[PDB]
Paper text:
The acyl-[name] synthetase (termed [name]) of the zoonotic pathogen [name] recycles exogenous fatty acid (eFA), bypassing the requirement of type II fatty acid synthesis ([name] II), a druggable pathway. Very recently, the [name] (533 aa) of [name] was found to feature a large domain at N-terminus (termed [name]_N) that is connected with a compact C-terminal domain by a flexible linker. As expected, a hexamer ring-like overall structure was invariantly formed in all the three types of [name] particles, regardless of a cofactor/inhibitor. Obviously, the pattern of [name] oligomerization is recognized as a trimer of dimers, which mainly relies on two interfaces constituted by the [name]_N domain.
We solved two high-resolution cryo-EM structures of [name] liganded with C10-AMS inhibitor (2.33 Å) and C10-AMP intermediate (2.19 Å) in addition to its apo form (2.53 Å). The decanoic acid (C10) as a favorable substrate, can be converted into C10-AMP by [name] enzyme. The occupancy of C10-AMP intermediate renders the [name]_C domain (colored hot-pink) in an ‘open’ orientation. As for the cavity for C10-AMP occupancy, a C10-AMP molecule contacts several [name]_C active site. In brief, an adenine base is held in place by the hydrophobic side chains of Y318 and I423, and the ribose hydroxyl groups form a hydrogen bond network with the two residues (D411 and R426). The K522 residue from the [name]_C domain interacts with the ribose ring oxygen atom and the bridging oxygen atom of AMP via two hydrogen bonds. The AMP phosphate is coordinated by a Mg2+ atom as well as the hydroxyl groups of S321. The carbonyl group of C10-AMP gives a hydrogen bond with H226 site. Notably, the W230 residue plays a gatekeeper role in eFA loading by [name], which is equivalent to the W234 of ttFACS.
Numbering used by the authors:
A (entry chain C), B (entry chain D), C (entry chain B): 4 to 533
The structure:
């Protein structure tokens, strides 16, 4: 590489060795297994770089990781990109066939796999044929990664290369039939860290990530760089606690004993943490959690606020860095009551620094920013994937019209708060009046004996589409279609006709098909009804 | 320009239209003359862009500004770069000959000059011959800039171009004989804003610039983008107060009545503000000021702290963005007494995010980071000027060894605090024991009747250099050389011989030569002694 | 495209419109469904080109075909490449998951699928998301392809483009875990036709494909361009008979009534044809069949020769055009008895024109051409795939050492006859004496009650590998391990020890795992034993 010293390159090694703050005695904690200082963390990063160089990993190679949230994962976030290699984060929650597909598609040279994921590997090990070495990670002294690090020196000269070198890659499930690989460069990750650290932390009092915080991720580190927050916490030089495999009791004990103040997780994990018996006696006053990946229920947000938790929502996807918007409350909004604060904190959020967010129709006409007009979110940001890896048509559809298409339908109010209604694929085309399936699912989710609602929508001769609803019920507490229709009626707002009782046609279904991740697979549900 | 939508360009228009926060009703205040909202600010930026397009200003053209800190200056920080033109900030405090040299060297097409600077223009107007139009700025309704803006619409489509397009340029005096022009691109300014906003604001409690702050610059806006802070305040959407021509009473009244919480100025301006009679009855508890451009005296810092001012130091130069290091205090350091806090806050500061700072010798050997070992600061950062404009040899000397040479001699302690001792050109070469002139000047500055000290140093046969000192005295309170030598003796530490009484050879001088900026011109002083 | 008229491009349109011979009244026969002349064939090719242009198919697009051997398939061999599009031949015998993987990987825009394959499509239709239109092919008047052709004119101006434009693509199963896509350009297909037509046809009397022949493929047209023979037959302007879905009675009736003289099929199809009851009364004197895809048994060749069939073997793979070698007999060899002629005709064959064939070791040392020294066949030819589509490491392994690695172990005698022993992956590493698994399988296949033999080989402490054998037996005619060992003993030649009775360790297995194609999947068999 022709390195011009005056031509600065935005590299992850600048995130590590030129941080906002660096305390060499600040601790990196891996649950109850390991503790070491930031100086030891840098030494281990250099040792891992030396080991990767010894293992034959060159610039441009792909190193795959199948591990829980640990210090090893963080050492992989830095070391693997910082030597010019591509870090492939494998979603361990995918099916073994999907994991095999991602491994073959990315063509990983080295796989760092935790010993608990060995049963997954054994199902697909014979069909990989592209990985030259497997390193088995363990939470004890017999870890192969630790032994590899021990043989290496703590000195390494990390190279200078183009900031557009691909640093991380991972595959999102979506609805494409096969996982789609998105990739991010060193420049994109550095800009993501800078922009979000300029967005949060510069807030007045609420929702700050600052140098005095103690960081504990509860979002898997294979899930879009764990929302890019491990890089941010390292850049701030804060104390980082890594819980490993998620157990609610272990998570709560780590929060209590390590004085964790900043965390991030999906709403289900927050619900599990708040519903745990031992969380009742815990002090949550100093704990801040940001909820992303799914819509934060207002009831869950209110319950968290009643525990003095600074809970606020965020939004992003695998293609977008991920962070696109974070809920930031003005001091006037912080003076509101608990219900209004829960309403504001459950929003999709205001767009973060350097992000252009618009809601558009099918023709990309940039719908007006009212609190009721819903359209597809299209974004421009410094940390968007340019395309899907080794894909053309899906890549073209992703960036149609010069904007990245999120596939999410939302309305943005006058003050800039986004509120996601549902997905684009879930739109119910009742003539010209498109309605969201999620609002009807939420309406039906308040029934006396309802368990799960999944509104599909199937073609209709007159209205084009009518919202067919699937409802699962409590055991032995059977509810008929007519009772559900009566309950759904008389609610606020409706489509085209009265309260849509003639179109809802609810059907009781034994089970709802779900993807490997856990979201409802409406594509499979359409097979059973149309 | 071939604009690839997925290839994001770091542009100032993204700073303006994609901020961290944007309150359309937030006010931009120009002292007691004008107030308007952020929406009006954006409308005026677009109107100014339209006017510049009408005036024939194309991409690559240079527009010069000779104005005080005003809303017009901010509208120039955005509009002029955001249309692809180069913003030339003219140092109005330079001599008219130097200003003429800078205007001719930069080849400005349009000059926006305040009516108070017209006497300066009239001395050099006949020798410019390169400016096609002069726009006279006034603080009333007869301002030509306001009339030009009034004729234009509030709609403009700002172009997309390479992020490496030069956005701002200005000339530093230095010691080169002629002013040297440094320039910064859109990418460099955006990265400066992002990095410093990640550095300050993410601090725990002390020295924060956050979205709830009220911003008032007391650093001239032609001085290295006013330290880049107007961009940062606009990016945060905070209330901005612009004082115009600096008057201590006006500044204090603006601080009191506009509830200013964040400011920045040179130490002399802070001393003037604290020494003003009306500052005694003012409440300074909520006011944060960062002191740059010169070393902050410990006594001044202590006096500011005794007024409950969150005062801390920063460091930079025209070539470096400018911000390279800012004093950030850990919570342990905030618990110290007033004297220790003043000692820590008066440091040069810890290097800011994405900045590599090293102290090196004449051979660039990266001296160890002890609290006593002094060397020249060499820096790498995303916001450094690549060279001097239309210069080769000085540009080569600036980036010698692959690092930007600051010309400042400093020691960096173990925890990362930089402490500038003096300039490289001011080094006294007493054999192998180089000593700083500023420490001797400070020692002699505590005399009973001393007024100003300027240690030069002239060649010596035995020791190579010996610290010749020039001392100015109080009127009619004459002090001889021997008395000054006796006072300077018996102080802590010395060079090569006892207390350097045989080498100091103090001489009483009527006046000390100073540059147009106001700093001591030791080059002229050398003419009178060697 | 910058078409220089003097710079001739080797295009398939030159194969069609500049043939060796062109009789406009020569017939193209699709079994008992359709008959039309060569003039009608050209008109239908131009109509199909017009329809594809109307359907939005541009140069570089991929059109997939799921059809039996028909006139429609041939019209696809010409029309789709001749307009600059890529013809994707889908192996309809693969599993639906593999077919879906190939469709997604190739990113087909249009799929021409026979109505009999609609059940396969319905299993994977929801997960394709990349195909814009499906054309359903039928053997009657309601065929969508025929209706599309009827709407178009018979005039088309086929473009001139680079001869290196990719014309055809298809996916081979192999042992890579996922199907690997190979592709061939217009130049490669034209050169394949020219070279093989120079190889066969220029033979003196035996094994000729000449202008007086009548052609009927019994090799699927998705299997490596049906061995490139449809192009050759079209280039010769011979009468072509296409049987559609393979039925032995239909095939024999077509051979008898259409006077078919040249055919090609796998050995299993030839065995089925010869074992059919109605083949006994048929006259096979004028019928020539070339057997490829698998080793031709000597017994089957002798049985075919006893029916006066000019049967000879050929060799190739999906990566190599496919044709690499064809059995061509000298007039002296044609005078030999039936047994010697069967021995010669069952060979892998002599390398065809413009093909470099070598047998090499693991270090690529070009083993000598003796009739006993076995090594891996590595080839250079004008019609080899340069790499696997969207693959790097498998592509690198394919062309390791500057030669295409066939993966087949063979010995080449002094006169140039190749004889494949087994695959490279099937090599038994008994110390330095590697032995072929297929020879042991053939030895054990002569047992009194044996049905299927699959020698795997599992690691051994002393000899590295020992030939573990799996044997399936006739129903209720159980045979023990010791009896099989006794039968296998006393045969000609052996490895390292006596007759390898101490290492064979035969095990009786209920069933042998097989791939979707039908070959033995020794990778799955290794899972059950090591
Ligand atoms: C938020 C933090 C703001 C602090 C940045 C201040 C930048 C000031 C740039 C400036 O004055 O530039 P010039 O080229 O005119 O002068 C550069 C020289 O000024 C001296 N300097 C600057 N800051 C200093 C501190 N904090 N202490 C001691 N000396 C300082 C240096 O000689 C520099 O080379
Ligand atoms: C006019 C002459 C026509 C003969 C060409 C036949 C080409 C068949 C291509 C094929 O079957 O390809 P695949 O990738 O599916 O399989 C390739 C592997 O098949 C085995 N093979 C092919 N021909 C063989 C003969 N004649 N004898 C023994 N084995 C054969 C090889 O393992 C090959 O790698
Ligand atoms: C700090 C801040 C943080 C936040 C961020 C988060 C991110 C996440 C990502 C994910 O999850 O991804 P994927 O897997 O691809 O997915 C995507 C999707 O999801 C959803 N979401 C998200 N987020 C949210 C949602 N919803 C609602 N709400 C919210 N917040 C959508 O659909 C997308 O697309
Ligand atoms: Mg996604
Ligand atoms: Mg300077
Ligand atoms: Mg093959």
């Amino acid at each position: 590489y022709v390195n011009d010293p005056s031509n600065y390159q935005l590299l992850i090694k600048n995130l590590l060795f030129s941080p906002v703050a660096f305390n060499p005695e600040q601790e990196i904690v891996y649950a109850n297994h390991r503790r070491h200082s930031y100086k030891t963390f840098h030494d281990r990063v250099r040792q891992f770089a030396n080991a990767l160089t010894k293992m034959g990993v060159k610039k441009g190679d792909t190193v795959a990781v199948m591990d829980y949230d640990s210090h090893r994962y963080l050492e992989c976030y830095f070391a693997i990109p910082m030597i010019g290699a591509k870090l492939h984060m494998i979603n361990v929650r995918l099916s073994p066939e999907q994991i095999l597909y991602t491994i073959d598609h990315a063509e990983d040279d080295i796989i760092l796999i935790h010993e608990e994921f060995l049963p997954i590997l054994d199902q697909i090990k014979g069909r990989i044929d592209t990985v030259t070495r497997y390193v088995v990670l363990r939470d004890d002294e017999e870890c192969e990664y630790e032994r590899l690090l021990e043989q290496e020196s703590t000195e390494y000269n990390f190279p200078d290369f183009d900031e557009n070198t691909v640093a991380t890659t991972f595959y999102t499930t979506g609805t494409t039939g096969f996982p789609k690989g998105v990739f991010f460069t060193h420049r994109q990750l550095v800009l993501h860290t800078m922009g979000i650290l300029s967005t949060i932390g510069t807030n007045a009092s609420q929702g700050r990530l600052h140098q005095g915080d103690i960081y504990m991720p509860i979002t898997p580190m294979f899930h879009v760089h764990a929302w890019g927050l491990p890089y941010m916490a390292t850049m701030l030089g804060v104390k980082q606690v890594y819980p490993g495999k998620y157990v609610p009791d272990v998570l709560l004990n780590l929060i209590e004993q390590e004085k964790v103040t900043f965390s991030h997780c999906v709403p289900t994990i927050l619900h599990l943490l708040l519903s745990s018996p031992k969380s009742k006696a815990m002090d949550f006053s100093g704990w801040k959690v940001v909820i992303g990946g799914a819509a934060l229920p207002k009831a869950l947000c209110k319950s968290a606020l009643e525990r003095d938790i600074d809970v606020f929502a965020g939004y992003g996807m695998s293609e977008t860095g991920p962070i696109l918007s974070i809920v930031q409350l003005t001091p006037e909004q912080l003076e509101l009551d608990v219900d209004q604060q829960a309403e504001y904190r459950s929003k999709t959020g205001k767009k973060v620094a350097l992000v252009e967010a618009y809601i558009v129709d099918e023709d990309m006409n940039k719908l007006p920013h009212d609190g009721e007009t819903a359209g597809e979110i299209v974004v421009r940001a410094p940390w968007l994937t340019p395309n899907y890896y080794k894909d053309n048509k899906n890549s073209k559809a992703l960036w149609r019209g010069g904007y990245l298409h999120t596939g999410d339908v939302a309305h943005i109010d006058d003050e800039g708060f986004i509120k996601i209604t549902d997905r684009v694929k879930d739109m119910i085309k009742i003539s010209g009046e498109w309605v969201s399936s999620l609002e009807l699912e939420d309406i039906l989710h308040q029934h006396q004996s309802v368990s799960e609602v999944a509104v599909i929508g199937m073609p209709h001769n007159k209205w084009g589409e009518v919202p067919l609803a699937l409802v699962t019920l409590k055991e032995d507490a059977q509810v008929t279609e007519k009772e559900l229709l009566g309950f759904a009626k008389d609610f606020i707002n409706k489509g085209i006709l009265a309260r849509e009782a003639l179109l809802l046609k609810v059907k009781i279904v034994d089970e709802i098909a779900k993807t490997s991740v856990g979201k409802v697979d409406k594509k499979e549900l359409r097979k059973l009804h149309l």
